[PDB]
Design a protein around this ligand. Sequence first.
Ligand SMILES: *C/C=C1/C(=C/c2[nH]c(/C=C3[NH+]=C(/C=C4\NC(=O)C(C=C)=C4C)C(C)=C\3CCC(=O)O)c(CCC(=O)O)c2C)NC(=O)[C@H]1C
Ligand SMILES: *C/C=C1/C(=C/c2[nH]c(/C=C3[NH+]=C(/C=C4\NC(=O)C(C=C)=C4C)C(C)=C\3CCC(=O)O)c(CCC(=O)O)c2C)NC(=O)[C@H]1C
Lengths: 313, 315
Amino acid sequence: PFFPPLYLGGPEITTENCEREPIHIPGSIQPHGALLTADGHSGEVLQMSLNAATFLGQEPTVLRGQTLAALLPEQWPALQAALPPGCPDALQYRATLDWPAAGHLSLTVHRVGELLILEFEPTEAPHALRNAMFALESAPNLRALAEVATQTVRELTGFDRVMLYKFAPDATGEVIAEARREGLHAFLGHRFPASDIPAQARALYTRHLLRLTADTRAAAVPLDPVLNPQTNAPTPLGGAVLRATSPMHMQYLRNMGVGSSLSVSVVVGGQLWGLIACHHQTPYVLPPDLRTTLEYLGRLLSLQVQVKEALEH
Amino acid sequence: DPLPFFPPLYLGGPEITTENCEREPIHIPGSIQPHGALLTADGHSGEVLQMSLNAATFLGQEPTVLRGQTLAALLPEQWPALQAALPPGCPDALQYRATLDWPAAGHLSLTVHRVGELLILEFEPTEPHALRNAMFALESAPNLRALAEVATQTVRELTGFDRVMLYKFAPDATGEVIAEARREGLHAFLGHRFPASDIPAQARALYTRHLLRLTADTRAAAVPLDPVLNPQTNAPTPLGGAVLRATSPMHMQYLRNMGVGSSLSVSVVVGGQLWGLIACHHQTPYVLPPDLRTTLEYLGRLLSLQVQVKEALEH
Ligand SMILES: *C/C=C1/C(=C/c2[nH]c(/C=C3[NH+]=C(/C=C4\NC(=O)C(C=C)=C4C)C(C)=C\3CCC(=O)O)c(CCC(=O)O)c2C)NC(=O)[C@H]1C
Ligand SMILES: *C/C=C1/C(=C/c2[nH]c(/C=C3[NH+]=C(/C=C4\NC(=O)C(C=C)=C4C)C(C)=C\3CCC(=O)O)c(CCC(=O)O)c2C)NC(=O)[C@H]1C
């Protein structure tokens, strides 16, 4: 099963119970964005991140009464149609708001049962993606495909190190390719145990395909209330990219000397084949539109991995 | 019966009938569609060899001036990028794309690929979260039918085409419209079935490698290359990888007979075989700009993946 989260007086995680930490219900988010939850029917704002006032420019109480209808007039009917009751928690809808306080915000919404989860992040506003797609397709074998993928991602993102991590049948890991800035250690060829990406983590990475930590020293921002009014239970955040990253897993990025990280899951035959793993030495908020490019690349790599593995077997 | 290609018309080959369907060399027509321009150049020196006859009017230069310069001089910023992206021995399927600001012609899209020692350069005029939203909707479709319907409707919304069908090949290469989105008033093709020779086998092989072709105007005359043969080889210039390459007159006649002014399709490729086709119709001529066509190319790949996934959920 899982332990209760901390804020419901559950045990503090260790290296003894690595498999039961509820990474999907931390009750908090990373501070480079803001999150609201809301009722599926009424559009009634039920929870907000204590930092919402910053991004939205709204007097705190104003929000926690109001309706999405009021708050987002153009958007609220689109949401209603895009995310019908009963849809999967994996389905997401995005829009760009030209919002008074903040030039442009990206809005990302998904639905978990009766709750809409809304994420707001700063945003903005060429051929590198098309060029990359053809490059991946003409790679002659899996090894070269891995090399092209890591190089392409590094060029698109500027990340200090981009690896292709591959899981063995027992969940043992292997960096099989790596693109990195001069003057970093080389993790190419190394392996790591199946514990280092635990079992509920690989389960969530199978369904929600891109997760990231923007600053390994930033404090999480609580949800208020912490419990969903609807249920008097924890809000599932597993499909939110803003959802707080396990302090366990941030402590290990710090011990490595990483200040910003990001992965895209590579899913083949319904299973987690491997990750596109990116490292930055300093804090780094990759904007939403560039993340989208990596999300596309994730799908394309998933296709090409199968194609390429089929021409060996 | 499968038989080798005839020589093209310009090398004294025969004209094409219902008898000799399978034997047109559809890849080497010696000509392009008039809404863009094409140059060929030597892959090592960058000497310009062939050009479409309309090139002066896209590129704003006399032929003899174009042909008298190397790509190093014509494309000083792109020439080194081309050479890195398209190394000798690379496959003909690999494409490099850039946008140019050309004085006389505005923003041009440049698409380049390499066939042996030849570079082929295509120039076309070029011009929010719809793709991301579509990607997730496709993935959440519960079964093959719902996927097919979401895919057709999405493509129609993105493009404005009068008719978008998903066309699926059977094992005998007969096909069948399994989903479609269509303009009000058009008659349905859904569930119809069409004989194998409707898409003959020399073109199904080509659609397994080069995943997007179109006819922008089914009455437009093709524009010859000049000279017609590659001076490197005194042989035909391979245009199977060029979206501009002129479209065969037997195909063009049939689209005309169906009342179509504009066509397009992306291939859906599963396990190395052509599974089907996102076919698009418009009643009037219609040019879809290169950046919009890129969205369809990306959807072609997504759909190939999702078709595998939906079919595996099915035994
Ligand atoms: C006692 C718990 C441990 C633990 C937990 C844990 N790990 C993740 C996710 C990841 N762990 C990774 C480990 C590596 N990072 C590397 O750079 C390398 C190799 C060079 C390895 C083996 C990786 C890559 C991930 C994926 C996430 C990412 O970095 O982008 C989680 C899940 C966190 C979340 O879902 O928010 C958890 C709880 N990992 C351990 O190694 C032990 C100490
Ligand atoms: C003697 C040869 C004949 C022939 C020539 C020919 N046809 C193609 C390609 C296509 N034919 C298609 C037929 C259909 N169009 C539809 O709308 C439907 C159903 C609703 C069918 C069955 C299709 C879809 C294609 C593919 C092209 C596209 O979709 O855009 C070619 C190859 C063209 C080229 O690569 O240059 C040729 C030479 N067509 C015949 O019917 C026979 C008599």
